[model samples]
Target chain A: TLPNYTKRSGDILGKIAHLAQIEDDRAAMVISWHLASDMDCVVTLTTDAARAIYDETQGRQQVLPLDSIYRKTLPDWKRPLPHFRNGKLHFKPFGNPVFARDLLTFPDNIEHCETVFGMLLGDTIILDNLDAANHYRKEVVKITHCPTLLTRDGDRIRSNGKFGGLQNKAPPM
Target chain B: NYTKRSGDILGKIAHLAQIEDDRAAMVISWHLASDMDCVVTLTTDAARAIYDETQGRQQVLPLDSIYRKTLPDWKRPLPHFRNGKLHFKPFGNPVFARDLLTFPDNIEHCETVFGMLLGDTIILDNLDAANHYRKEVVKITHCPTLLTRDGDRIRSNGKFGGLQNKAPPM
Candidate 1:
C-alpha cells in the first residue's frame, strides 16, 4: 500500500470526461428536483465561477443548498433538509442567490464514495465584466461515483452508514 | 382606541396560513430604533412546524415585558402592544406604507414563495449587499380577499373580509 498514495482524478477517468467513463455520464449526473428525492443531493460553485459571480470581494466558495436552487414547493418530508445542516446556524444556497442567472451549479456527484465537489469544477469565464457567477453551463469532467463499496484491493463491500442515530434531532420541541 | 381591531387582521392571516388556533402560534416584538426605526412583526408556524422551517420564533411576547407598549404613532391606529403583534410606533418622519408589508395580502407579484420573509428596507435593510433588489414574492400568500373577484372580501367580517386598512402616513 502506498501510504502517501493519493489517487488523482486521472487515475479513474484516465482523462476527464470521455476518456474512460461512458459518454453522457456527465449529463446524467446533473442535479435537479427530479433527482435527489431523498434530499441527498449537494452542490458547490467552481472557484473561477464563484469569483466571477460574487467577484473576489464578497462571493466565496459555498455549498448551494437544494432548497435555495430548488424552484418548486418542497414537500415537508425531506428533513434534516439539505438547505440547512447541523441545525439552523449554517445555511446552503437555498435562501441566498435570488436569480437563476446568479447560480453556477455543479453536481455533487460522489467520486470514490466521497463528496469531492471542487474536483468537478468546470465553467466558461466571462471577461465582459458582466456578473461572473453566470456560466455557459459547461462541464469538463464526469464526476465519479462508488455505487457499491469496495476494499483496497477492489473487493465489493456492502454498507449502510445512514443509521437511525444520524437522524436530525428535532428542532427544540 | 382601535387596539381591538389589530387582533382581527392578524388572526385572519394566521388562519389563511393555517396557523394553529392556539394564541401561541405567533409572537410579536417591538424592536426600538431611532430615525429609521419602525414597529415590525412577522409570523410563521410554531405549534405545527419548527422555527427553522417557518423562519420564525415560538414564544408569544410576554405582556409583562418592558418592550410591550402602544406608541402614539400615526401609523398605528390600534393598540400599542398585543399578543402576536408589533406596531412600529411612528416616531420618525413616518416611513411609507410600501416600506412595510402589513396584512396578509395575496401579493401575486411577490417574489420568494415558500415560508415567511422577515425584514425589509427599514427592518432588515442592507441593500447594497443583495444580489438583486425587488419586493416580488413570486406568488405565495393565498389571501381569501384576493381569491374573490376584483380583490373583494369573502364577506365583510372582522375576521377575513372588509376593505384593506390603509397604513398610516409615510
Candidate 2:
C-alpha cells in the first residue's frame, strides 16, 4: 500500500523539500498521480536496493533494470528503474492518460507539457513519441495498455472500467 | 609563390561556370587577367574550349593569350531567385549575390550569370578581400587554358533571352 502526499500546486521547489522531509523514512517508494501509471512508482532507494542497482549496472550508466528491486509488477507494466544522473533523478516515462488533456491543450508550451507529464527539475521524465492527440500512442495496441485502466488475469484482456476517454472535439460544419 | 607561374598567368583562380550532367564540365582553370578581368577555360559535356570576361564584356579567348582540368569536387550552388528569374550564388562568395543584381533583367540564365561573374572576378574579390582567392591558391591546379573553336561568347540561345529581344525597337 502507498500513502499519498498532497503538496500545494505552483510550489516549484516543493519536490526537493518533500524529499528532504522523507529522508529518515525506510520506505523505498512513493506513489503519486504525477507518475505515468498508477502501478508505476517513483523509487527513493534504501541501501540494499541501491546496491542491487549498482551491482546490476556497474556504474556504466545510472539506469538499471526495474527488476533489480522487487515489486508486484503487472503484465503490461514493464519499465526501467529511475536512477540519479547528472545530479538529478531521471525517469523513462510512459504517457499518463490523466495528463493527455493538459498536454493537448498546450502542445506548444514546453513548461506546461513537461509539468503535466511530471517532468520537473528534480523529477525528469523522457517521453519517446506521441500521436495526433499528443498522447504517447504506440503502434502496438498491447504496448498502449495503461495498467491503471486495464486488468489482465490470464491471456484474456480485461478492463478496470475507469478509462473514460478524452472529450471529443466538435466538428465545425 | 605568386611569381612561380608567368606574369601573364596573372593572379588566383576562381570557378566561373558549370554544366551539371552525368559527366559535368566547369570553368575549372581560370585566373585574374587584371583586378577586374579574368581568363576562363571551359569544356562542354563532350568538348573543350576557353573564354574571357573583361571590363563587363564576355568573349572567346584570343588564340595568342588563350590559357586553361578536371572536375574537382563540385558543390551545388545555392539557388537565389531575384525578380522572377533564377540565379545561383556560389557557396563562399557573398558579393556574387549582390554583383548579380547589378545587371539588367534576362540575367537569369545560369551561363549568363556565371559568365558575368567569371568576367568580373574582381567583384567577388572585393567582397571577401581574399579569403576565397587565398584558399583556391593551394587547391587550384595551375594548367593552361585549352584553346579550341568551342570558345564562343555567352549569348542568349533560348526564347527568354532579354528585354531587348522581345521589346519593339524604338
Candidate 3:
C-alpha cells in the first residue's frame, strides 16, 4: 500500500516538473520516481491517509487522528534530522538549485564543488550531504558541459537596444 | 684634565646605563631637567649609544638629575610656587651663570636645562649684585644676559640671542 502511494506521488512530481518546463524534466521525473519507490516505507506511507494508518497499526488497531499519524508513523521525527539545522536544509552539493547550477554550469568539477561545500558547511552533516549530492550532480554537470545545453544571458541584449552580437568587438567610442 | 673629565663622563654614563636597564635613562634624564634643573653631559658616542638604545623603547628621558645639577644657584634656594601662577622672580640668579659656562660645550645640556627650568624662579640674595655680575659677564664674555636677566629677557625679548631689553618684532 505504501509503495503504491509513493508511485502516485512520483507521478505528481513528474507532472510538476513538466509543467514548470524544467531542463531534463523527464530524467528528473524518472529519478524522483525511483527515489519514491526506494524511500523508507514510513515516508511512502506518510503520503497517503489510508496507507499511513495501515502501516502505523499494522492492521491491528482502530483508526487514529491525522495529527497523531506523524507520531505513530515517523517516531524519529524529534531526533536531530541533520538535513534541517541552522535554518538550512542540507543535502549534496547538487541537491539544491543554486548549487546545482553552479556545479553543472560554471565550475563543472566535483572536487571543486566538494571543496567549496566543505568550506561553506564546515564539519557538519551538510558537508557530508553535499558530498553525497555530488554523485547525482556530477552527471548533470557532465550534460551541462556540452555547448548545446548552454544558454546565453538573453536579457542583457533584450533590455539594451542592441542585440550585442556574439564575438563582435566595438571600437572605443 | 681630559682624563678626569672622561672619568666623570664614564661614571655618569655607567649610572645612566644602569638606570636604563631598570626603566629608561633618557626619560629619567628629561624628568630630572624639568623637576630638578640639572643637565647631563656625555660624549657624542655615549649620547649616540644611549639615543640608539632607547629610541624605540622610551619616548622621553627622566632629566631630573641633570636639571638639579645645572639649576641656577638662585633657583635652588627658592621653592616652586605651590599654585600654578607664574613666579617671575623665582628664576633670577648667579647659579645660572655657572650652568651656562658648564653647558657651553654641551648644547644639548643647555637646551635641556633651559626647557626644564623655564617656568621656575630664582630667589637672589641680592638682585643688585646678581644684575651687576650678569651685566659684567655680558660685557666681558658677551654673554648678553645672566640667568635671571635671561629669564626676564626670554619673558620680554622672546628671541634668545638678539638685542637685549627689546621684545621680538611681531
Candidate 4:
C-alpha cells in the first residue's frame, strides 16, 4: 500500500520540485500535474513498493525484479521481461497485453524518473540506472506477449475484446 | 555611307596619329632603338621575310646614333635587344605613359564601380598591386588573355574610340 495523504503529498512535492529543477518549466508543470493527478496514485504506489524493496535489501543490490513487482501489485497492469535461453536473457514479446502497456507507460514517467532517480542515485548513478531501466524495459517488452486489451463499458463488452469470437464469414475463393 | 566610312577612316587616322604620338614619345622620352646591341634575329621565315622586305624602309636604325640624337641625357649602360635570338637583362626604370591613370588602391572598391568597365587585365593588375604588387605582369595576364590578343590595349583603344564622338563636331 502507498503512503497516505501527508507523506504521499510530501513525496510527490519533492519529486515535482526535483523535476522542476532538472527539467524545463513546461515539463516540470506536466510532472507537477502528474503528481497532482489520480494517475499519480499508481506511480506513487509503484515507487513506494520499489523503495520498500530497496529498503528490505538494505541498498546492497537490486531488490525486486521490477517487472514482477509491477505485475504482482497492479491488477490490470502489464510489463515486459527478458526470456532466459541457453545462458543469456533473451527478449521476445509474446502475447502479453499487460507488458505492452508497461512498455508504453515508461515514456510518460521518463522526465519524472530522470529527476527523481537523479536525486536518489546522484547524477552518475541516475545515468547508469536509466540505461539499466531502458535495457530492462526493452527486454521485458520483448518477452511479454501482447494480444490487445478489451474493456467492458456500463452495459456492453467493448467491440475489440481480447480473445473474443469472430463473426462467421464465407471462405475466400 | 561616305560619312560612316569617313568617320572610320578618320578614326583609323586618329589611331595612326596616336601611334605616331606614342612613337614620338618613345623617341623623345627615351630612345629605345639606341640601346640595341646585337640584332634580334627572326625565328620564323615569315618574320625574316618581313624584316628582309622592310630592311631599307623602317627596319634599319643605328642604335648609337638614335640615342645620341634623341636622348642625350639617357645613357645605355648595357646594350639591350629583344631579338628572337638572345635574352637581355633590363636596366633603369620602365617607362609608363604619363597620361595613364593610376589604378585604385582598393580593388574591391574599384570593382564595385568599374565591374565590367575596367578591363579584367587591369583589375588583376590592380588587385596584384593592392596585395603588395608581388607579382609579374605575365602571371596576372596569363590566364584570360593567354589565348586572346592583348586585352589592356584593346580596352584602351575601345575607350579611346568611345570618347571620339562624345561631343558634337566643333
Candidate 5:
C-alpha cells in the first residue's frame, strides 16, 4: 500500500510539472493542491532543497488534502482527516537574493537587505563632502546588526544614533 | 501590508516544513522587492552548526531562548491571577491540550512554526528605554490564532503561544 501511494505521488508529481514551470518536480518531498470558487487551482511543492516552490498553473488538478499528503510522505502520520477546521492559508514570497552583491543592489532583494541592515538608508545619502561619506561608510562597516542610525518619534526625526556626525538631507517639495 | 504579507509567506513555509519533517525543504518566491526569495532549509545538523556559530560569536542568548520564556509551559501549573483581592482561575479543556502538552519537554519541534508566526526578533524588557533606538528590527505585525490538532483555536496576544484552560492535565 505504501508503494501504491508512492506511485500515486509520482503520478501527482508529473501532473504538477505539467501544471507548472517547475525545474524539477521529482525532487519534491510533498506536493499540495487546492481549488477556489472561481475554479483556479494552486499547487505548492515542498522540495528538499533550500527553498519551497509555489506553482499555480491553469485549471484544477486532483484534490490533495494535507492529511493525505502526510500519509503519502510521513512514516507514521496517524492524524485523521481535517487537520484543522477553518482550512489553510497559502503564501508567496516576494523575492530572493543570491549573493551579498545582489543584497546590496537588487530591488527585489531590498526587503532582505532591510532585514540585514535593520533599516535601509535608501540609496540616496546626503553628505556634505566625500570625507563625510567615507566616515559614514566606516560607521556602517562597524554595525553588528539591528542598527539604528535615526529615530522616528511621533512622525518626527529624533536622535541620529550612529550617524550623528552626518547631516540630514531635506526632501524636495 | 508588506509586513503582513511577509508573515503569511513565512507561515506557509512553516506549514510545509512541519508536514515534511524528515526532509529539508526550500521556499522560493517572487516579490516586487526581490526577484526570488533567498530562503533555504537545511537538515537538523546543518541548522545546529549555523546556530552554534552565531551563538559563539554573539555570546548572548539566542532570540528563541528569550522568546521561549514568554511562551506558556503546559507542564507548569497554572497560577491564579489576582485583581486586588479578586481571584480568577484560568479555564480550558484537556482534549485540546494534548498536541502541545504530550510533546517532548522542548518546543524545538515547532520552533519554525512558532518563530515564523511570532516574529523572529528579540523582545525587549522595555520599549521606552534608550535601547529601543539600538534594538533589532521588529518582525511582529499581528498575533495569530493557533489551530491545534484537536480542532481548538488558541489565541496568542502579546506573547508567542498561550492557552485558556482550567488546568493542563497532570
Candidate 6:
C-alpha cells in the first residue's frame, strides 16, 4: 500500500515533484505523475531556469517563458507596478472548495518580481510536504510571493492554466 | 606611406586600435592597406566599416566577424537616417553611431525606447584599450538593442545595404 498521510492524486504529484531533483527532475516526475494519475501539484520554478529558457531562445524570437510571475508581468517588470486604488474592469481571482494548504498569490508588490509562472492558479493542487516548501519556493520563487492568501484545492481536475500575462491598464470600472 | 596612389587615384587609409610609437599594432604585424598607402590617427570605434580582413576579432568592434573572410561582407542614401547620404565603391566607410544620432535629432516623446544590435561598439584608442576586455567581443547577431534600425547602413536593393539596417520612424 502507498504512504497514507495523503493518497489523493493531486497531493501525491505535489509530493513527487517536491522530492524530484533540480535537473530535469520535475520533467521526470511529470512522467511518474502520469503513471500515478497524479492530478495537480503547486509548482514553482527558479530564476536560473528562467534564464536558461531565455538563453535557448536567444537567436530566435525574444519571448520569455516562466512558471511564476507578478501582478502585471511586462509593465511590472518595467517598474514595480502601479497601484490602482479602485479601478475598473475586470478581475481578482477567487476559488471555492479550497484545499487546506493552498493559497492565492497576487502579483503587484513593491519589489514587483516577475517570476513568470503562467498556469499558476485555480488548479486542483495539493500543497504537501511542508519540509520542501523552500525547495519548492526556489524552483518557482515567483509563486510563493508576498500578498499571498492560503487557498484550497477544489474537487475538479484542472490541467491547463494561463496566467494573465500583461496589461496596459484599461483601469477603472 | 601617406602618399596618393599614382597621382591621387588612391583614398585615405587610417591607423587603428593598437598604436605604439604612432603605428597601428597587431598581433602578427601591422598589415598595411593594400588598396591605399593610407591617414589620421584613429582611435578605436572611430570608424565602423574598416576591418582587418585577416584578424578574427577587430581592434575595436567586438564579435569575431573579422575572421579570414577572403570575402566577408550595402546602399542608397535615399531617405536615410541623418540624411547620411552615403555611397560606396569596393570598400566603404563605417559611420559613427553618435554622428548618426547627430542629424535629425528627434525628441518626440518617450513612448517607445529605441535600441541597436551591431558589432560591439565602444570608444578606445590603443592595443591596451582594446585588450582591456581581453580582446573578447560579444555575439551581436544574438543581441537585442534598446533602439531600432541599428546595423550596417545598406541599401534596400543592395546585397546587405551599407552595413547597419535603417530604423523606420515611429
lDDT for model 4 comes to: 0.24
Question: lDDT of all the models against the reference?
Answer: 0.20, 0.22, 0.26, 0.24, 0.22, 0.21
Binned by DockQ into CAPRI classes (incorrect, acceptable, medium, high), candidate 3 is incorrect
True contacts kept of 3: 0.00
Candidate 3 per-residue lDDT over residues A1-173, each given as its tens digit: 11233323334433332333235533333323332221222222211353344335543222211121111123323433233345465443333322212222212332333322222111111112212322322332222110011112110101001111221111121
DockQ, structure candidate 3: 0.00
Once fitted onto the true fold, the runs of candidate 4 whose alpha carbons sit more than 4 angstroms away are A1-20, A24-27, A39-140, A145-173, B1-170
Best by TM-score: 5
Residue-level lDDT for B67 in candidate 3: 24
DockQ (Cα-based) for each candidate: 0.02, 0.00, 0.00, 0.00, 0.02, 0.01
CAPRI accuracy category, model 2? incorrect
Each candidate's B-chain TM-score, in sequence, is 0.17, 0.21, 0.23, 0.16, 0.23, 0.17
Candidate 1 local lDDT, B57-151, one digit each (tens): 22111111111112332443222223435433322222211223333456333312111111111211121211111111111211111011111
Evaluation by TM-score, superior candidate among 3 and 4: 3
Better of 1 and 6 by lDDT: 6
Better of 1 and 5 by lDDT: 5
**Per-residue accuracy of model 5 over B57-123 as CA lDDT, tens digit each:** 2111112211132345433331121233313321221111113212234545654434322432222
lDDT tens per residue, model 4, B1-170: 11212223322322222332333222222211121211222122332233345431222111111101123322312112223322333222223231122234543342221111111222112211211111122222111110011111111101101111112222
Listing candidates in order, what is each one's chain A TM-score?
0.15, 0.19, 0.24, 0.22, 0.15, 0.20
Q: What share of the true interface contacts does each candidate keep?
A: 0.00, 0.00, 0.00, 0.00, 0.00, 0.00
Interface RMSD of 6: 22.6
Better of 2 and 6 by DockQ: 6
Error of 6 at A67 (Å): 7.8
lDDT (tens digit, per residue) of candidate 6 on B7-47 = 12211111212223221112101111221222111221221
